[PDB]
Amino acid sequence: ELDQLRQEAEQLKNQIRDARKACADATLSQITNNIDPVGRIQMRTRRTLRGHLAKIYAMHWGTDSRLLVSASQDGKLIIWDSYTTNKVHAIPLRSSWVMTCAYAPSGNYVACGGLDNICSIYNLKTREGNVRVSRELAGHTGYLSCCRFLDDNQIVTSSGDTTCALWDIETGQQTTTFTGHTGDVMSLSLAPDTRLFVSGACDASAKLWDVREGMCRQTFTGHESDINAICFFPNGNAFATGSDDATCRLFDLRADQELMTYSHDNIICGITSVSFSKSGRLLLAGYDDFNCNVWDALKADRAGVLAGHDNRVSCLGVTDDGMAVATGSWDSFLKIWN
Amino acid sequence: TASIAQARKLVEQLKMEANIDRIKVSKAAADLMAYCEAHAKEDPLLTPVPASEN
Amino acid sequence: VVTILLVLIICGLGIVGNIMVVLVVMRTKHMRTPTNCYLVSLAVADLMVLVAAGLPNITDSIYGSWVYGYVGCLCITYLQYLGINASSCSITAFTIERYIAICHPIKAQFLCTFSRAKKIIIFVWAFTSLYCMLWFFLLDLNISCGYKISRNYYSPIYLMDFGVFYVVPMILATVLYGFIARILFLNRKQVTKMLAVVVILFALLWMPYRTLVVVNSFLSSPFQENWFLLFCRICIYLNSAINPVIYNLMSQKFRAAFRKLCN
Amino acid sequence: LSAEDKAAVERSKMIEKQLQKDKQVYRRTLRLLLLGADNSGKSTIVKQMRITSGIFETKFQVDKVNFHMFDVGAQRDERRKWIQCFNDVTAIIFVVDSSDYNRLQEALNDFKSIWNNRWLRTISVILFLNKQDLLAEKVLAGKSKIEDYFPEFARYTTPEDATPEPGEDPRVTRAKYFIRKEFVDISTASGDGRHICYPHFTCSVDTENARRIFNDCKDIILQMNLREYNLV
Amino acid sequence: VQLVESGGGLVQPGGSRKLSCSASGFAFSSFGMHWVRQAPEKGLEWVAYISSGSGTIYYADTVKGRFTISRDDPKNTLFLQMTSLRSEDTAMYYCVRSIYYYGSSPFDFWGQGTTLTVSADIVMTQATSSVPVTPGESVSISCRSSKSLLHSNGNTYLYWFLQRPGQSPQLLIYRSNLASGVPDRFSGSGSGTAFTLTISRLEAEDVGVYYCMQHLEYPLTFGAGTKLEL
């Protein structure tokens, strides 16, 4: 049984590898060599935030490109006004070690979580004005790594227990739970359709789960380290995965394999964040070298570098409209570039 | 049956994953490049917009 | 002319040291600490006191006259005094910071911060500028840069330069470093040696000029012998050049930042 | 300037004042990370430091200064990822069952893993060898010998510069000093001085438990300042 | 959420009076307070404003010197002390909460108010004061202003308040952006100069007085008000 099952699993893995290799007609480079060069993208700092107290460890852009949510390691969420730089909201968290934060697509709810293993969703449009604990849901036996809102009543979350889960706000329980990975899930990213979402864990692989059914339709197994960041392509057919090996990889849902590996010899520090622009040409990735990089999703050439921060960049995000890019680092300073 | 249980679970997972269609990389790369060139003007990060739009 | 060459080489050493320290603490990312702020203050003070005190003396020794004119001489003399006073003020602030960090680590980790360092350095710089502004009204040529009023009338000012800018800072530095060595021995084998060398150098290099300016402000015959003034200038230049070397190059963080710049 | 924008600026200034009032306490407080396996007496330590939650924060005041100890005993086995967030903390208190020789190997492995960590490379790791009474009783009973697990224990000489406590048996002293020497060897390895361990023999009832935290954190901050303030 | 006002009554000319307002159901300090007067058989008129934490205070050019506003945050209360009360002071005063931030809705909750009887800013002018209409039809109230409310930031600083028989003015629109608790029947349109409030389907609860307000400059001025009856 165990031996025959192991042999069958090995044969299935070899068959999947052979099928993925047969469809590997060519690499993304051969086709992205004719496209004109993108040139240097020299982004300058338009805003400078000086409100955070501890290391900024999370961020996200809501439906409105003017409000920016950012979480600090002291248990504090801050919704900044990107345009006027003012502080729209300040939420003191009951958990000091917060590592994830997201802004609901309706602009009324904001999620957070971390080592507390309890995802807390606060409401911003409360009749009482003050920020209230809307839903402090629990059930995960591990630290929360990322949070993403699917609607005003459901939210997907990834915990250190190796299992992701879609919870319902009104019910406050798991709408659905996905099978556990080989390691702790570290990042999440929703597709434009909100039906499927790809998630990466400590194991060198990324699984594409479905919101309708709890099953990973695809499982990429290309990496040489633990994935710490992941972001979906604006179209939803591909997604970039970043690990601590200082190398990003663009996987595709249709081809079911890596398209291009963004890496450089002078970069030895791991990666912590990955994000795309509204078009997808510019792949932005935060590196532990106290600076962020921006490569060409097609050409893979170094398009720009952001060395404004002074500490390890923790997270970065592009606006829904692409007017600017926010970047939160461990220097307690979040910078908006454009 | 923990051992054989997870064995058969991963076996069924690999099976249902292999049944998913997989197109060549050329078509995927072409579609990605086309989608990128479609929204080129709508990407202020890629195309520097004038100071009047910021 | 050997004196001109000595002054020139000492000024060049000081200038290169200060410029390297500035490039190390400014163009670096992880230098946002109070100690680094005090170091930048001391560097931009002693460099302005070196370039503003080296080139005029070199020109006076080469050409034998003061060519900068009235406004030029006033400006350069004000810059020299401002730098010489800001050097001592920054040394005092840095000694107080070292004491608070060594003898009061718990309270230092809470009080000592980069914002408070900026506050303190800006305050001491403003006070030094306001104290040096007096030289704009009590200075004039005699063609060599001199004093419009007799040296006797300048006894209250120079006395302060010896009282609160030489005696007070020297006493503070020596007492603070003695307490630091006491706390280190009673829990650190080389830090005490570096602090003792710093104290000895500071004292032996700031005694000559601070004593000459004082004795000349009371004696009926101002001691203006070329050799003693040259020795005092050389001592001041050496002190200002070793400040960025004895306080920074003899440290682990500065060496790390240096190797980073040249990695 | 619009009126609503002025009101928003005033709200932002109020929020800044609030965040400054909060940062006051956040800075006047010291962060400590308590680590230890299930066999380790970290629970008894927290019970003694009384001067599905994956994190447990405990505030205790000693010598008129606060300490926020973070205990994590309700998470997965591996801790290479969630440990990164605990950088810049005051100290890391590692607990180990110095009496149970069976788990001593795993305790040393975990200590070496937490010490050679790339993110905690510049973070001191305080060491409390808890359960000294059980260790003494076991080494006196003679039924369990450390030689069975560690061959070096057979060729290990008692330190000459030791400081045996009053009333301690030679075997107890030798065993505790061998444990401390093993820990110090595992620590100094690739230490580089940026971070040093602080082995301390802690009993199960010794009220002077948080005093050890204070005495260790004082020296840790002193050493960290000697480098940042340009002393060493 | 409640704002209960008190302290009104009869006052002789030249006297004084402290109008109090107790707030509950929300963070009183987080919301700036506005004291707005309404003369008998007339429309609204802003009087005073106090920001959060008492960091900023403003009064109308006609009420400066006599009226002084204050707020006790520990008790979540607002006070307005009036001195040298004149004959025109006869009116009903209302306390309104307003929080200012992107996506907010200032002046969202109006208190019941209290009646007190005696014995160059932007002006809002409405064309019609009363429009007869029956249920089922749609209404289009117009509003004119002397200064363009379109600020350089692009925000339409226009507020619509619906006061029903016996109730206080209710917020309809704060910036075309519909207000909270108001059905989608009410909509706003127009440019920075002219404005239009459109009701697609009338109901028995819509009868009342609609007042327009500008918020470009701190000194406010309400319009004459358009009346809708059965």
How would you summarize this macromolecular structure in one to three sentences?
Chain B: It is a lipid-anchor. The structure holds 5 chains of a larger assembly. Chain C has helices at residues 2-26, 34-63, 69-103, 105-111, 114-132, 134-137, 155-185, 191-216, 226-249, 252-261, and strands spanning 140-141, 145-146.
Q: Helix amount of chain A, in percent?
A: under 10%
Total number of β-strand segments of chain E? 20
CATH architecture of chain A: 7 Propeller
Taking strands numbered 1, 2, ... along the chain, how are they ordered across the largest sheet of chain A?
1-28-27-26
- How would a crystallographer describe the biggest sheet of chain E? 7 strands, mixed
Counted up, domains of chain A total 1
Structural class of chain A: mainly beta
Total domains of chain E: 2
| Radius of gyration of chain E using CA atoms only | 17 Å
Instruction: Write down how many β-strands of chain A occur, each being a DSSP E stretch of 2 or more residues.
Output: 28
Can you tell me the CATH topology of the largest domain in chain E?
Answer: Immunoglobulin-like
CATH class of chain A equals Mainly Beta
**Biggest interface, and residues per chain?**
A-B, 58 and 39 residues
Q: Helix count of chain E, per DSSP?
A: 0
Q: Under CATH, the topology of chain A is which? A: Methylamine Dehydrogenase, Chain H
Ends of chain A: how far apart? 59 Å
Question: What's the assembly state of these chains?
Answer: 5 chains of a larger assembly
Main sheet makeup of chain A: 4 strands, antiparallel
What's the alpha carbon Rg of chain A, rounded to whole Å?
Answer: 20 Å
Give the overall silhouette of chain A. globular
PDB class: hormone
Keywords: TRH, trhr, activation, thyrotropin-releasing hormone, hormone
Entry title: TRH-TRHR G protein complex
Chain A: Guanine nucleotide-binding protein G(I)/G(S)/G(T) subunit beta-1
Can you characterise this structure?
- Chain C: One of its GO terms (molecular function) is thyrotropin-releasing hormone receptor activity.
- Chain C: It is a multi-pass membrane protein.
- Chain C: It is found in: Cell membrane.
- The structure holds 5 chains of a larger assembly.
- With about 350 residues, chain A is mainly beta.
- Helices cover about 5% and strands about 50% of the residues of chain A.
- Chain A has one domain: YVTN repeat-like/Quinoprotein amine dehydrogenase (Methylamine Dehydrogenase, Chain H).
- In chain A, the strands form seven sheets. In chain A, strands 1-28-27-26 form a four-stranded antiparallel β-sheet, with no helix packed on it.
- The termini of chain A are far apart.
- Chain B has about 55 residues and is mainly alpha-helical.
- Chain B is elongated and about 65 Å long.
- In chain C, helix 3 packs across helix 4 and helix 3 packs parallel to helix 7.
- Chain C has a two-stranded antiparallel sheet with strand order 1-2.
- Chain E contains no helices and 20 strands.
- In chain E, the strands form four sheets. In chain E, strands 2, 4, 5, 6, 9, 10 and 11 form a seven-stranded mixed β-sheet that branches. In chain E, strands 13-20-19-15-16 form a five-stranded mixed β-sheet, with no helix packed on it.
- In chain E, strand 4 and strand 5 form a beta hairpin.
- Chains A and B meet through helix 1 and strand 17 of A and helix 1 and helix 2 of B.
